[PDB]
Amino acid sequence: MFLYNLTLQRATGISFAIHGNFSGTKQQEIVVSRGKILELLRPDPNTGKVHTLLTVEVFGVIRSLMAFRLTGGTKDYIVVGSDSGRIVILEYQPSKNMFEKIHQETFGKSGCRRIVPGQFLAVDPKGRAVMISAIEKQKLVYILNRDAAARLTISSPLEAHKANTLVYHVVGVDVGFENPMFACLEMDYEEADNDPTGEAAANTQQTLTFYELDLGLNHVVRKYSEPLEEHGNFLITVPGGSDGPSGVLICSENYITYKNFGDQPDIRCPIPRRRNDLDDPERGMIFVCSATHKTKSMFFFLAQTEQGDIFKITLETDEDMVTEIRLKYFDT
Amino acid sequence: NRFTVAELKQLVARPDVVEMHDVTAQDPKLLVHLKATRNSVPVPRHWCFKRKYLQGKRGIEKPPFELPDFIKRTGIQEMREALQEKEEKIDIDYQKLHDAFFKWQTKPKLTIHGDLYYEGKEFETRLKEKKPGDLSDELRISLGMPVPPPWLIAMQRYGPPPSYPNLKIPGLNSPLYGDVFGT
Amino acid sequence: ECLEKKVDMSKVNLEVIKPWITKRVTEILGFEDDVVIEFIFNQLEVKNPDSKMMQINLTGFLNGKNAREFMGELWPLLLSAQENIAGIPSAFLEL
Amino acid sequence: IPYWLYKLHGLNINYNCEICGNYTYRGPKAFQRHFAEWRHAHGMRCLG
Amino acid sequence: MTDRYTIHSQLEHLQSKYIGTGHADTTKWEWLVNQHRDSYCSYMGHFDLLNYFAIAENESKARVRFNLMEKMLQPCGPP
Amino acid sequence: GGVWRNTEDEILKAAVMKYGKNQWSRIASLLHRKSAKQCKARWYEWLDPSIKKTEWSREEEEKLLHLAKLMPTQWRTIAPIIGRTAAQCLEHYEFLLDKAAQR
Amino acid sequence: YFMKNHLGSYECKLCLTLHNNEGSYLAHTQGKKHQTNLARRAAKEAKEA
Amino acid sequence: AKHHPDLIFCRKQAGVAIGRLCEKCDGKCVICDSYVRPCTLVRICDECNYGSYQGRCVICGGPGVSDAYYCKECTIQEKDRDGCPKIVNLGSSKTDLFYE
Amino acid sequence: PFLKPDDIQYFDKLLVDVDESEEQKERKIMKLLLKIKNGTPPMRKAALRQITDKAREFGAGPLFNQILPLLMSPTLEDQERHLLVKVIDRILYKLDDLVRPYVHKILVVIEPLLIDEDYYARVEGREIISNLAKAAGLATMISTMRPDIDNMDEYVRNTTARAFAVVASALGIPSLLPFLKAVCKSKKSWQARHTGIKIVQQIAILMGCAILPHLRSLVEIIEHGLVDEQQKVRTISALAIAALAEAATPYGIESFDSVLKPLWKGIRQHRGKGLAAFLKAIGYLIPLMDAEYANYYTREVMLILIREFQSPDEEMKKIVLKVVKQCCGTDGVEANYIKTEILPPFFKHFWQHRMALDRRNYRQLVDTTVELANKVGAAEIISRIVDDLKDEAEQYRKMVMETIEKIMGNLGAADIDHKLEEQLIDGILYAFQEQTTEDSVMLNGFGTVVNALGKRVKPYLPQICGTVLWRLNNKSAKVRQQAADLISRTAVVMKTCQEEKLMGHLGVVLYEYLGEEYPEVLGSILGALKAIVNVIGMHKMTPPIKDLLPRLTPILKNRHEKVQENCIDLVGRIADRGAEYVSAREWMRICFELLELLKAHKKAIRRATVNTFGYIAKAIGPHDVLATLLNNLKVQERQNRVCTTVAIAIVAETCSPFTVLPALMNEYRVPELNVQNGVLKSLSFLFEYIGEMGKDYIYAVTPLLEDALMDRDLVHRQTASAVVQHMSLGVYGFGCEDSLNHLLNYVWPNVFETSPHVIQAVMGALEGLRVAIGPCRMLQYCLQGLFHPARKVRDVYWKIYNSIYIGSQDALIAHYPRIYNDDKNTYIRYELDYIL
RNA sequence: AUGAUGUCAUACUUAUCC
């Protein structure tokens, strides 16, 4: 019984979605990430409809999708993190209607292993380097630099592993063309595995560690690290440099605390809930996703809660520090 | 700190797979659960032996190997033997070898997924359980009866066998075609 | 032992620990050398030093008996300097 | 006197099968074979 | 503070550097905790398995991911 | 070559007992280690049944001591006359008598 | 008990061992007393002496 | 490998330096040590290729001419996604041969 | 085995025959050393093992007590030394905590190995000190080696510094830092600080590229010595900065930052060696600076650099040389400034017959000149150094020759004008006409020159090849081989320009020398023929192949390493490419001659041989030639056979094995064992080469593997297992897994044994079976074995389970069975039991 | 009737190597 499998309707559920100038023009594309296929969407600004520009099956489980662009460039790249042991940089060609792989370097074995990188992938906002790390005990950072013929080239990756440390979510810090830092939520499970009484398992909170990559030394090191008050689920990269102050917003259960590195004090804000909620009061409230809208004048953020409450996140700031985080429920 | 074998066999639901070396493990419950799985295979018998599973066949000098019928029906073995006798060429055919490799291809006797290689694995040619009422050809030839086997004539007089009580054999209480005269 | 409590050299001085370490090295090794003073300077250069690594470096430097007493005397003086709000040991308050 | 042969074979080992008419065994393999035997099954059938 | 225990090296041999491989003298609880950590990492890595695990429960995806990340350290307790 | 192992010595003794004595080519075709001259030399040196390989006495020592001065060379001529007839035990006994009397 | 191999060597059937040369199989005659171990097979084949 | 069992590999971090093979060790694989089915090229470490250590063979260690590649049997067995297999140690090989 | 007349002093205790009556018997039996030192190679081997396994028994004390005198012996050999080094290693792989009292007592003899003329001696020494330091403890090493720092002799200080370098490579920089950082600040005496700084250096050389992380701390240590009142400390300090920066690949510039401003200042005021040292440091620094800051700073260095060309110091000239490379090889430097200021003094003082006779100065000079060419251009440098091709001495001619070679290699010959090109070709011929020694430099030089000139060389050919023939006589022994090789490398140029008469010449003229009795010549001749074949094609060969090939055939007896090489190569090229020109009879004769070429001691010979044998296998067809392979006596155990096996493989590829297999499988029947395992190997390599096509033949091989894997003798299980491996990788994903499971049954018992080759074989086997069958079945065989407290089954099944674990760790999740939860722990994973 | 160790040949592997 020799069979032949065929696909009639492709998967419409999207696991990740990025936006940017992937086509290299003024129109922005919507790179959606399905289960076993990659999709490139292009929304019509006049007609108000989103058309599928390209649809290619990657023949694998893509676990991370991010976009990046070099300084002074006019097109956004496509970093694709899959279940394979290699990192693939894709560049879509509108003249050929296909995604051309720029670089492909192997880092480990295949499969969705805990020691195999591909679950988390963060890119620098300046386009100087990309950081790919696993769920635990594996972290790699490769440098991206343009060639003489304006071709994107990758360098040797830098190993930044840490034993008995679990990574929840990683995000690159927005630096003003300085040394790029990669902030991530860390959790050391070495003490909890060596205590049968369970006392070391309790009172073990997540630690926000910011690992800086020294470009002059060509090596990454954990520069800053600080424990958190509660366990966090996701982070929000705040734009810094010339546009706004540097820092990151850590989303947690019924609380949000943006804590920048240096002398910036930690400012926390609880998550607002609906009036006369019919749900159980013992259950918490966390964020599901977050969007960032950056402009030349100012910048805003839009994060949806567990109940789908999309709130307009705004952060008042001083000359060099942050003042307060002012949130307002936009819609449902 | 280590439970006995009787306590480990009384606690396990399938005590027909417990061994004497399983009590010296660090977790006998997980080993007993994994050893009683549906499609699991046991470990080799060289875990306690000291012959390294390859030193027991010292004096055994049997046939090194046997060629299949698809290679023996091509005439290459006789030509190779003639060339070896001349040294101590043929050019028979080119399409007959392709025909013996494609059309006259014989599927070999494979094994089951749990059929692991034993130590000897040549003197225990066991095969199901050819019981009462079912016999092989040749022994029919020694018996020499043309198409009941005649001592089921005496299974009339002396009675149905104690050893296989459920028995039926043809013509008596079992009302037979080819070889098989009882079920 | 006495090398299990976590300490920190950033909250203690360094100029007040040189004479006690010099007297301990002159009592242990007999004479005055330049490798032991450099090892004592390198052991206190870090803001978070290691007591077990310093004991191993000085645990065998002598013979394996005076070095343990030297480590036990240097850990208690550093603990008394870090526990005090000034950052000085007990031998510096009198003189 | 084959002391080493009896030690390697497993002789002079304390073992007893109470199911096989409270008999004693000189080895662990002999105790395992005596638990499933004709006398042990006969005693189990006579016990009920 | 004589400890007489300097696990440094011998002849550039062994020196386990991987995580989850195990040894011949590995205990049952340590192997069970390593298998549970590998199962948690495989649940966090596979997107379809995480979706099938979150569709059954009434919790969200990020809450289940944070619960699986928080339960990775000391899952059993006694190694 | 010519290590003269015990399993080869037993095969050479069996070939000398079975085939014969004056047929050296017939005995060399069943050993695959030595030639016919080496097999005949081994049969005349160590595999001979009349060779007295032991029992060194004082009469034979006095006979060999009263013969090495009359003929200094030609030890093979005094091999059958002394009674050893091995052509190497005479030189070994002469070396032992020269080393023991030197001190 | 002498058996020939397929590579120009001898193999002992009673001793169940290999022989490197022709002198090796010829020295396992006085030695390799597998002939004394055949008394159990002779008693199993015939119960009488 | 099958010729030298006491040799140890480098297994360092993979860089951007493409590996090379000497003229005496041309065509031989690094892991599988075979001559057929080349599927993946060999990448060297950053410390293993610097200055006078660049352009040298991985297995032979001599003057590299052509680029080295990995076997397809080692590629399908995931033996090529490991670290840089640069021959660092050299024991029981080409030591007594220099005296003769 | 015999005692040298001196060694009696050591081994006298063995001479006395008193025997059989404690420790005295261990020293007495320890004379097995003597068996290692002097004797037959087998005695050395067996002795060496016997003493390895007795390490734990005898202990380090008696050994070293009875060794260190020998390795200390004034009469010691080269070999004997090296061997005692070996025994020290092999015993130090075992003894760990034991050696602590003897560490210094070892190093004292060993540290002289680090400074030595022999290189292999040095890499050995570094290795065994690595094994010692890592073997002993850090504190053991440190506390050990202090008193040698202030030792009066500087020798021990130096070699001790390299010792700290080795131990620091062992135990890492950060562990040893506080020791050093304590040392360089020692206020007692300067000699210490000098030592410690030298230690910084030798760490820089040894660790090299890997210094990078701690570079900052290291600098922060060393910086305080630059200003010291003593001189040495300053000199060696700045030198150590140099070594750092040189291992400091284009980065960490700011770590050197605070070091600069003093250095530059010192550049002004210094006379003598220290000055040059600073120039060394700054030299390696400049490539690490910014082209703007380094603009200024560089332009300052250039002055002193100019002025200092003229010093007689050769240390000076080395330094300032490499400097000129780095400073003037900077992208931020202007050509004309170099052309005027530098080149005339450069070629004046630096190009002289003092330099070239030396080695390092030779090389470094070559490099620097090459780079100056890389900037100012080609015609300048070459144009100035051409006239020296005609200079008397060789080594000088060799120097300018290789220089021209590299130059025209990089920049290309396009820049060169006409007249200078005449002087070129004439120079190269002239220099080539007088060769005192045999070497490539002149030849590769010529070839690169011509291939670079392209067809601008065409007017020069008749002069070339005239010289080529006349030299092609002169002296066969010396120059025949060389003129021949010259043809070989000039082939393509003598082709593309379409001079056909010249191809007639070389064709039949070279054809005539094939009767040359000198092998070292004949080899070069055949090589030349080869190169001529790769330019002019088959049917256009002026010596038609009908002539040539049978004329080649008898040469295969020639034994010679170069004849056999080139010969077999050429027979390969022609046998592969045309192959029709020659009748089959000739071919099969070639076969029966090729058969014994497999006695070659060289691997490449066998290489070309087997590949050829495949080519002619295509020229004829399988059955006959594979039968001629199966004729083989197998006679040699150590290889000499399995190459024929490889021929069986490649032959089975060249025409479909779909034909060949039944003959082989029948030939396993033969009672001769070594050829049985032979055909097993043939299956192994066979599947390795066929790959996917095994989707069918698996079945055919399956029962035979059953017969083989069922063990007659270990080699059967081993080789058959390898077959299972390559089959298992090859068939992957095509749906044949069932029979592979059946074979896995018979594979499985072989798991247990101590024989290295069969256990590693079985490992490869079960790995391939892992990927092919899928992990689930594997793990279902590997479960119960884990548990087993018996010191064997657990070792192995855990080794296996690890092999299964590392790969496919992601896919294992489903297959871990249900394991009930005990009191303190919950062993049920309930996530999988959530049901919609 | 395996297995034990030990003197002592004999084959085999490592594409071992001038």
From Swiss-Prot, chain A:
Subunit structure: Component of the 17S U2 SnRNP complex, a ribonucleoprotein complex that contains small nuclear RNA (snRNA) U2 and a number of specific proteins. Part of the SF3B subcomplex of the 17S U2 SnRNP complex. SF3B associates with the splicing subcomplex SF3A and a 12S RNA unit to form the U2 small nuclear ribonucleoproteins complex (U2 snRNP). Within the SF3B subcomplex, interacts directly with SF3B1 (via HEAT domain), SF3B5 and PHF5A. Identified in the spliceosome A complex; remains associated with the spliceosome throughout the splicing process. Component of the spliceosome B complex.
Interaction with PHF5A, SF3B1 and SF3B5: annotated segments: 105-119, 145-168
Organism field: Homo sapiens (Human)
Location of the protein in the cell: Nucleus
Residues of the full protein shown: 1 to 332 of 1217
Signal peptide: none
Domain of life: Eukaryota
Chain segments carrying region Interaction with SF3B1 and SF3B5: 193-231
Record protein name field: Splicing factor 3B subunit 3
Family per record: Belongs to the RSE1 family.
Biological role stated in the UniProt entry: Component of the 17S U2 SnRNP complex of the spliceosome, a large ribonucleoprotein complex that removes introns from transcribed pre-mRNAs. The 17S U2 SnRNP complex (1) directly participates in early spliceosome assembly and (2) mediates recognition of the intron branch site during pre-mRNA splicing by promoting the selection of the pre-mRNA branch-site adenosine, the nucleophile for the first step of splicing.
Recorded domain comment: The core of the protein consists of three beta-propeller domains.
UniProt-annotated site: Interaction with SF3B5, residues: G284, E306
Phosphoserine, modified sites: S156
Swiss-Prot record, chain B:
Modification comment: Methylation at Arg-51 by PRMT9 is required for the interaction with SMN1.
Keywords assigned by UniProt, alphabetized: Acetylation, Coiled coil, Disease variant, Host-virus interaction, Isopeptide bond, Methylation, mRNA processing, mRNA splicing, Nucleus, Phosphoprotein, Spliceosome, Ubl conjugation
Residues making up the signal peptide according to the UniProt record: none
Subcellular location: Nucleus; Nucleus speckle
Superkingdom to which the source organism belongs: Eukaryota
Effect the entry attributes to changing R38K: Does not affect methylation by PRMT9
UniProt disease link: Craniofacial microsomia 1: A form of craniofacial microsomia, a disorder characterized by a spectrum of craniofacial malformations ranging from isolated microtia with or without aural atresia to underdevelopment of the mandible, maxilla, orbit, facial soft tissue, and/or facial nerve. CFM1 is an autosomal dominant form characterized by mandibular hypoplasia, microtia, facial and preauricular skin tags, epibulbar dermoids, and lateral oral clefts. Affected individuals also present skeletal and cardiac abnormalities.
Protein name (database record): Splicing factor 3B subunit 2
Gene (UniProt): SF3B2
Curated annotation (Swiss-Prot), chain D:
Localization per Swiss-Prot or TrEMBL: Nucleus speckle; Nucleus
Tissue localization of expression: Ubiquitous.
Matrin-type zinc finger segments: 15-46
Domain of life, source organism: Eukaryota
Function: Component of the 17S U2 SnRNP complex of the spliceosome, a large ribonucleoprotein complex that removes introns from transcribed pre-mRNAs. The 17S U2 SnRNP complex (1) directly participates in early spliceosome assembly and (2) mediates recognition of the intron branch site during pre-mRNA splicing by promoting the selection of the pre-mRNA branch-site adenosine, the nucleophile for the first step of splicing.
Family: Belongs to the SF3A3 family.
Quaternary structure (record): Component of the 17S U2 SnRNP complex, a ribonucleoprotein complex that contains small nuclear RNA (snRNA) U2 and a number of specific proteins. Part of the SF3A subcomplex of the 17S U2 SnRNP complex which is composed of three subunits; SF3A3/SAP61, SF3A2/SAP62 and SF3A1/SAP114. SF3A associates with the splicing factor SF3B and a 12S RNA unit to form the mature 17S U2 small nuclear ribonucleoprotein complex (17S U2 snRNP). Identified in the spliceosome 'E' complex, a precursor of the spliceosome 'A' complex. Identified in the spliceosome 'A' and 'B' complexes.
Official protein name in the record: Splicing factor 3A subunit 3
Gene: SF3A3
Curated annotation (Swiss-Prot), chain H:
Gene: PHF5A
Protein name as annotated: PHD finger-like domain-containing protein 5A
Cell compartments where the protein resides: Nucleus; Nucleus speckle
Annotated region described as Interaction with SF3B3, given as residue ranges: 78-81
Species of provenance: Homo sapiens (Human)
Site, Interaction with SF3B3: residue positions: V16
GO aspect biological process, one term: mRNA splicing, via spliceosome
Residues where Zn(2+) 3 binds: C29, C32, C71, C74
GO CC annotation, single: spliceosomal complex
Pfam families: PHF5
